[PDB]
Design an enzyme around this catalytic site. Structure first.
Site, short mmCIF file in Angstrom:
data_model
loop_
_atom_site.label_atom_id
_atom_site.label_comp_id
_atom_site.label_asym_id
_atom_site.label_seq_id
_atom_site.Cartn_x
_atom_site.Cartn_y
_atom_site.Cartn_z
N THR A 1 -9.89 -17.83 80.99
CA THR A 1 -10.82 -17.30 81.98
C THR A 1 -12.13 -16.88 81.33
O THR A 1 -13.21 -17.25 81.80
CB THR A 1 -10.18 -16.12 82.69
OG1 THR A 1 -8.83 -16.45 83.06
CG2 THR A 1 -10.96 -15.78 83.94
N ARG B 1 -6.18 -21.41 86.79
CA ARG B 1 -5.14 -21.10 85.81
C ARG B 1 -4.84 -22.35 84.99
O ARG B 1 -4.10 -23.23 85.43
CB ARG B 1 -3.89 -20.56 86.49
CG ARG B 1 -3.01 -19.73 85.58
CD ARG B 1 -2.04 -20.61 84.82
NE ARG B 1 -1.45 -19.93 83.67
CZ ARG B 1 -0.84 -20.57 82.67
NH1 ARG B 1 -0.75 -21.89 82.70
NH2 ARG B 1 -0.34 -19.89 81.66
N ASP C 1 -11.26 -20.86 72.08
CA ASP C 1 -10.16 -20.53 72.97
C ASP C 1 -8.85 -20.98 72.34
O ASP C 1 -8.73 -22.11 71.86
CB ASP C 1 -10.35 -21.19 74.34
CG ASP C 1 -9.56 -20.48 75.43
OD1 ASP C 1 -9.18 -19.31 75.24
OD2 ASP C 1 -9.32 -21.10 76.49
N1 GSP Z 1 -8.13 -10.48 89.21
C1 GSP Z 1 -8.33 -10.87 87.96
N2 GSP Z 1 -7.58 -11.90 87.43
C2 GSP Z 1 -7.78 -12.30 86.16
C3 GSP Z 1 -8.74 -11.69 85.38
N3 GSP Z 1 -8.73 -12.29 84.17
C4 GSP Z 1 -7.79 -13.26 84.17
N4 GSP Z 1 -7.19 -13.28 85.40
C5 GSP Z 1 -6.10 -14.19 85.83
O1 GSP Z 1 -5.24 -14.49 84.76
C6 GSP Z 1 -4.71 -15.80 84.91
C7 GSP Z 1 -4.68 -16.53 83.57
O2 GSP Z 1 -5.94 -16.47 82.94
P1 GSP Z 1 -6.15 -17.28 81.57
O3 GSP Z 1 -7.59 -17.35 81.23
O4 GSP Z 1 -5.52 -18.62 81.59
O5 GSP Z 1 -5.41 -16.34 80.52
P2 GSP Z 1 -5.32 -16.81 79.00
O6 GSP Z 1 -5.59 -15.62 78.18
O7 GSP Z 1 -6.27 -17.90 78.72
O8 GSP Z 1 -3.80 -17.28 78.82
P3 GSP Z 1 -3.52 -18.76 78.29
O9 GSP Z 1 -4.67 -19.64 78.79
O10 GSP Z 1 -3.46 -18.77 76.75
S1 GSP Z 1 -2.04 -19.31 78.90
C8 GSP Z 1 -5.56 -16.51 85.95
O11 GSP Z 1 -4.76 -16.78 87.07
C9 GSP Z 1 -6.63 -15.51 86.33
O12 GSP Z 1 -6.76 -15.48 87.73
C10 GSP Z 1 -9.50 -10.66 85.91
O13 GSP Z 1 -10.36 -10.10 85.23
N5 GSP Z 1 -9.29 -10.25 87.20
MG MG Z 2 -5.37 -18.20 77.11
#
Ligand code: GSP
Ligand code: MG
Lengths: 341, 846
Positions: free
Chosen positions: A28, A152, A174
């Site tokens: 994200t 996602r 990332d």
């Molecule tokens: N409401 C809200 N949801 C969030 C926020 N940040 C991330 N999310 C949610 O978290 C979910 C996964 O986000 P992601 O970016 O894939 O996490 P990641 O750290 O990259 O995890 P991965 O990609 O290694 S599996 C998404 O569905 C997104 O909607 C936020 O600040 N607010």
């Molecule tokens: Mg991630």
């Protein structure tokens, strides 16, 4: 030789190593950063994420201490419909599937399943798109950049991204957060500039998909403890974040999940006086966020020895303004640290 | 220092003749001016005061143009001698016709003074000879001047002049000798630093390929130079694509080396390997290293090519023909199986000990196995090379008897010390001068002038306290306070140095000028007396050659000339003209003289610092080259090679340990830029193993080499005598201890490893073996023997977190108090069933 200058433009660059468990927001936040400083299957995977979520609820319906019953059991075939496509590698996403998803999404047995989301692995943007896709139940719609950031995607492997902030070079990576991927992060440990460890703030009442028995937040705490002590990491300060501030706030406002229930250290906990909360901010929420903040600070407190410091901030990834402001501050910090070498 | 002191003058002769030319110039100029002076105004009543000067002048110019003589390189000594004697006779004869009361003492006096200084400077007389000639000339001059207090006064002048002169002379001489020694040591350093550079270059080239070696010959990034003297250890490793790789295992090499001389094996091995080297240079392929019964090479890795496959396979053919010849040259019915594969490789160097540039990839193991799965005589080629083999060779799909492979068959003297002595002599002489200035008044029970006694005591205390400074600076008693010494000699800077020396040399003149306010000018005796005094005083300023030229020269100049020109109006008048003349010419003398001598001083300093820099540099260079040698080879073998061309050494006993990282390749992801960072991690690990070697107790062990995931160590080699204080075979234990250490070590390495654990297996054997080296201009020491492949193929069969141990070693180690849980019996290539033992006592459940 064309190399006498290139090495310095490397020295003129910022390496941003992202950490954090899966679903933390790493994907994200890097999506956010690209927008802030910078070919159709995107619209597809969203539905798939949808296709995931619509399953996760119905699947876990029978996987709770009550078998989650529909308020409208006549749509059980609908359930079965989803259970019929419970594992479809490809899927055209026919409109009847959209209707089947929505009709149950308005069901209140489905609502009782969703409200107890903590007790099973589940995506975060679920209820959001469970309404956003009713707008794209048809096929000729291009989802919002807001949906783009809420998309996602599972992070798996080095995803390098370069950009420029007012004639300053920035190169983030990332990297997934799931257990197996954690064998990789070491690859990026070579002279990185800044180490953005994000943590899903709201993931204190849930467990990781690894074993579904270890608290997501407690897990990441242990993780950060380990990394804060890494024999190659004792020399670079750490920039910490707490993603999904909003979702955590909703957890508090619901008052169903109890941090002290998950972590009794919050019951006997005191709000620190240096708290600088926003206007109209529940003081209990301020207490809890700084509780977690110190809970991580504690690890960065028991060691470090003035060689690498923490700078804990707050973040809601869907709030591009939050990202912008805190990132500007981080830019200050990192442009300071850049010459610390 | 017999003929070395000869060589000194041999390079001092040019500057010596230079000084001599300028000296003779001054001498002739002096005789000329005295002739014309005694002619023009007064003393025209006789010509024997000028004609002698003229014949002496032409004698001087004959000396000058004569110095160009060739039969001169030793006779110049007597040249100087006789020239001095001529000066002597000239001056004394011009002197004696005096005592009419109209001639002055100070004229001939100054003459003698100049004679003495010039001799002291240039004529190079041996200390004894120089001195005796000086004193004889002085006594003769004063005794001819005889034709009570005045005489002892003049004698004191003579002796103090002799003192200052011997000082100057010895200083000049020691400067010469020391400076010569310095330039000698410096050229020594040049001609040995060159050969140190050459030797370390032979080293680095015999450890790294020519291209990358010459790259390291740029010393641009001082990171690799910081390896001589911090999170991730630095290292240069690059990914390269589409090169060829060739292995070759000597078929039944073991059975070949059955009963070799442990020295003949050495020769034949190095022979065939020099054959292979002879090949690779022509075939344009880079051999890498030699692994016991095997050896391997690469094709165009530093220098990319397109025919690299051709180069490699033709090199293979050359090896085939060479082993064929040797097979019927030495008549050894032993061949070698050979394999090849092309692809990409990450190439670099890892480890701080015994490290040699090397190469790794899955393609590496691919070619490796394809070889150890390839038939003898016919090269085992890959599809990866067949795709551009270009069928210009005997293409043969060589199917194994069990991935698209094929076969082919063809087609002293311290500057401080100096300062101390010169201060000593300056104060002593000035002292005896003012002593005479007092005893000048011998008739009065107490002499009138009181300010003279005041400044007497004052300057006495000043110079004697500076003396105490110097003597506690040298003899180093530290009786008062070392803090006082430090803070009070910090003021002895470089420019304040100049100023304090200036004042210390200025003080004698004002001191004797305590006698200037009184009346002397009527007395013509006191007049010549004080003239002699002031000239003897001004000529002192020379002695501090450590002090500046323009400074000291101008200071002496003004301090002499001022009061005398002043008292030229306070008088015995024309004598003023003559004395200012002689004073002036003397000034020009001393000016040029101290000039050239301070030159000598600057030169000595320059030479000292230069030779010091060269010594420091050769020190660093020998350090670095020794470090590289110790990297490539052990110490006792370094002893042997310096005395022996080759090396060879059997060892009936010896322990060998292999540590192989099992889960590396699976830990290794290639989806990054070849995942080369994983190899950075590997390099970190190997460095953390190298540090285990530098443990004092673990200095006893010898790391043989490393092979990618393999770490290879052994001992029983530096052991040259069983000690009564050490159990003979206890090294096997301390070697084994090493296993217990690094097996533990990786856990810490794993402790810094998140959600993964490296797991290595360690195989140990003990017994006989042999050690040898490959060749010159390409250095590599190694070991061979039955125990070698035994333990290798042994640890090949081990289990991580456990220690696979040979049974015979198992006995002696159990006797060394260690515990083992029996593993069973395994199958070894050529060795069949072999009983093994695991060390950890059921590390798992059981
Ligand atoms: N409401 C809200 N949801 C969030 C926020 N940040 C991330 N999310 C949610 O978290 C979910 C996964 O986000 P992601 O970016 O894939 O996490 P990641 O750290 O990259 O995890 P991965 O990609 O290694 S599996 C998404 O569905 C997104 O909607 C936020 O600040 N607010
Ligand atoms: Mg991630």
């Amino acid at each position: 030789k064309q190399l006498q200058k290139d090495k310095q433009v490397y020295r003129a660059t910022h390496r941003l190593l992202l950490l954090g468990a899966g679903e933390s927001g790493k994907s994200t936040i890097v999506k956010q950063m690209r927008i802030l400083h910078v070919k159709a299957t995107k619209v597809q995977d969203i539905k798939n994420n949808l296709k995931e979520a619509i399953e996760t609820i119905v699947a876990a319906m029978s996987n709770l201490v009550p078998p989650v019953e529909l308020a409208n059991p006549e749509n059980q075939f609908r359930v079965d419909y989803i259970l019929s496509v419970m594992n479809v590698p490809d899927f055209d996403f026919p409109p009847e599937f959209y209707e089947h998803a929505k009709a149950l999404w308005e069901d209140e047995g489905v609502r009782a399943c969703y409200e107890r989301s903590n007790e099973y692995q589940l995506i975060d943007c679920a209820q959001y798109f469970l309404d956003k896709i009713d707008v794209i139940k048809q096929d000729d719609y291009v989802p919002s950049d807001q949906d783009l950031l809420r998309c996602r995607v599972l992070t798996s492997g080095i995803f390098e991204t370069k950009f420029q902030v007012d004639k300053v070079n920035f190169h983030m990576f990332d990297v997934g957060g799931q257990r197996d991927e954690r064998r990789k992060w070491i690859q990026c440990f070579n002279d990185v500039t800044a180490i953005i460890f994000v943590v899903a703030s709201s993931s204190y009442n849930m467990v990781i998909r690894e074993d579904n028995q270890t608290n997501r937040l407690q897990e990441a705490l242990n993780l950060f403890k380990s990394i804060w002590n890494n024999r190659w990491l004792r020399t670079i300060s750490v920039i910490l974040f707490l993603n999904k501030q909003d979702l955590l706030a909703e957890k508090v406002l619901a008052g169903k999940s109890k941090i002290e229930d998950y972590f009794p250290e919050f019951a006997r906990y005191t709000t620190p006086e240096d708290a600088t909360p926003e206007p109209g901010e529940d003081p209990r929420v301020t207490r809890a966020k700084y509780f977690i903040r110190d809970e991580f600070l504690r690890i960065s407190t028991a060691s470090g020895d003035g060689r690498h410091y923490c700078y804990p901030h707050f973040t809601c990834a869907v709030d591009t303004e939050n990202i912008r402001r805190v990132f500007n501050d981080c830019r200050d910090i990192i442009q300071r640290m850049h010459l610390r070498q | 220092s017999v003929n070395l002191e000869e060589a000194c003058m041999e390079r001092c002769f040019p500057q010596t003749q230079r000084r001599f030319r300028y000296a003779l110039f001054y001498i002739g100029f002096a005789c000329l001016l005295w002739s014309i002076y005694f002619g023009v105004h007064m003393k025209s009543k006789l010509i024997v005061m000028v004609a002698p000067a003229l014949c002496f002048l032409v004698v001087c110019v004959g000396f000058f143009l004569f110095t160009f003589t060739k039969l001169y390189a030793r006779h110049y000594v007597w040249t100087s001698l006789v020239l001095t004697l001529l000066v002597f006779a000239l001056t004394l004869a011009a002197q004696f016709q005096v005592l009419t009361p109209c001639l002055s003492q100070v004229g001939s006096f100054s003459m003698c003074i100049e004679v003495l200084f010039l001799l002291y400077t240039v004529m190079h007389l041996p200390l004894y000879l120089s001195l005796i000639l000086g004193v004889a000339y002085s006594v003769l001059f004063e005794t001819f001047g005889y034709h009570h207090w005045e005489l002892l006064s003049r004698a004191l002048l003579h002796l103090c002049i002799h003192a200052i002169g011997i000082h100057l002379f010895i200083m000049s001489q020691v400067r010469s000798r020391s400076t010569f020694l310095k330039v000698g040591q410096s050229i020594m350093h040049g001609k040995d630093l060159e050969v140190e550079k050459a030797l370390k270059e032979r080293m680095i080239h015999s450890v790294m390929p020519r291209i990358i070696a010459d790259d390291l010959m740029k010393q641009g990034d001082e990171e690799s130079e910081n390896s001589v003297k911090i999170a991730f250890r630095p290292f240069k490793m690059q990914q390269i694509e589409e090169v060829s790789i060739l292995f070759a295992d000597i078929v039944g090499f073991t059975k070949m080396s059955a009963n070799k001389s442990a020295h003949a094996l050495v020769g034949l091995l190095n022979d065939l390997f020099g054959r292979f080297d002879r090949l690779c240079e022509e075939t344009k392929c880079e051999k890498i290293s030699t692994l016991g019964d095997c050896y391997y090479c690469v094709a165009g890795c530093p220098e990319p090519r397109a025919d690299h496959a051709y180069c490699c396979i033709e090199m293979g053919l050359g090896m085939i023909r060479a082993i064929e010849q040797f097979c019927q040259e030495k008549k050894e019915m032993v061949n070698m199986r050979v394999g090849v594969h092309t692809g990409t490789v990450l190439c670099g160097i890892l480890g701080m000990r015994r490290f040699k540039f090397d190469v790794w990839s899955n393609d590496v193991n691919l070619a490796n196995l394809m070889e150890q799965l390839g038939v003898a005589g016919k090269v085992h080629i890959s599809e990866a090379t067949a795709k551009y083999l270009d069928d210009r060779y005997e293409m043969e799909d060589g199917k194994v008897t069990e991935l698209k492979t094929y076969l082919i068959a063809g087609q002293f003297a311290s500057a401080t010390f100096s300062s101390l002595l010169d201060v000593l002599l300056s104060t002593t002489v000035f002292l005896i001068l003012s002593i005479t200035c007092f005893l000048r008044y011998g008739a009065a029970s107490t002499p009138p002038p009181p300010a003279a006694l005041a400044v007497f005591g004052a300057a006495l205390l000043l110079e004697i306290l500076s003396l105490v400074v110097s003597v506690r600076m040298v003899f180093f008693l530290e009786d008062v306070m070392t803090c006082t010494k430090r803070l009070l000699e910090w003021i002895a800077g470089w420019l304040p140095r100049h100023f304090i020396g200036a004042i210390l040399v200025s003080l004698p003149a004002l001191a004797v000028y305590s006698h200037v306010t009184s009346e002397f000018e009527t007395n013509i005796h006191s007049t010549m007396f004080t003239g002699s005094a002031v000239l003897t005083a001004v000529v002192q300023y020379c002695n501090f050659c450590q002090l500046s030229s323009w400074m000291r020269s101008s200071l002496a100049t003004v301090v002499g000339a001022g009061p005398l020109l002043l008292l030229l109006y306070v008088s015995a008048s024309l004598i003023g003209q003559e004395v200012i003349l002689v004073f002036f010419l003397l000034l020009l003398l001393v000016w040029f003289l101290n000039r050239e001598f301070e030159v000598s001083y600057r030169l000595h300093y320059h030479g000292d610092v230069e030779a010091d820099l060269h010594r420091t540099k050769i020190q660093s260079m020998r350090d670095q080259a020794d470090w590289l040698l110790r990297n490539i080879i052990p110490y006792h073998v370094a002893e042997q090679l310096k005395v022996s061309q080759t090396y060879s050494k059997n060892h009936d006993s010896g322990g060998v340990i292999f540590a192989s990282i099992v889960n590396f390749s699976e830990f290794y992801e290639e989806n990054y830029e070849g995942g080369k960072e994983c190899y950075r991690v590997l390099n970190e690990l190997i460095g953390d193993f190298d540090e285990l070697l530098s443990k004092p107790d673990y200095s006893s062990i010898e790391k043989i080499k490393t092979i990618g995931a393999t770490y290879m160590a052994a001992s029983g080699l530096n052991a040259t005598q069983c000690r009564d204080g050490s159990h003979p075979q206890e090294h096997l234990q301390i070697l084994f201890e090493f296993a217990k250490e690094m097996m533990r070590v990786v856990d810490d390495f794993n402790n810094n490893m998140l959600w993964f654990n490296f797991k290595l297996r360690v195989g140990f054997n003990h017994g006989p073996l042999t050690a040898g080296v490959i060749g010159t201009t390409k250095l590599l020491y190694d070991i061979w023997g039955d125990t070698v492949n035994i333990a290798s193929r042994m640890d090949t069969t081990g289990v991580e977190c456990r220690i696979q141990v040979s049974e015979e070693s198992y006995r002696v180690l159990s006797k060394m108090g260690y515990e083992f849980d029996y593993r069973g019996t395994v199958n070894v290539k050529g060795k069949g069933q072999m009983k093994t033992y695991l060390y950890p006592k059921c590390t798992d459940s059981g």
